[PDB]
Request: fold
Amino acid sequence: GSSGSSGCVECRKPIGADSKEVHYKNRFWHDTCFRCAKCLHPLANETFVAKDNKILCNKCTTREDSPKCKGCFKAIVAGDQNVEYKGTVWHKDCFSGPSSG
Ligand SMILES: [Zn+2]
Ligand SMILES: [Zn+2]
Ligand SMILES: [Zn+2]
Reply:
């Protein structure tokens, strides 16, 4: 504690006193840094939610997060062919089952 100056964890830059920052979970984000990770929306004037060490908004928190692949990381579709194993599902192709060599 030779200086002790609240800084940002996103831009790793120092925050000013006049600059409206957001202190949460022993952290601080700039009025332009503090925002969602899915829609990238600033929760400066809107509520926010922190889950699994990740910042998100109420609009996203809801069940509006379609399934995503792990082999290609592409938006998966119900009709489309996919392979579910442990929480995550890999496209029929991405998934290499032992069904054959
Ligand atoms: Zn920042
Ligand atoms: Zn969001
Ligand atoms: Zn895939």
Remarks:
- DSSP finds one helix and six strands in the chain.
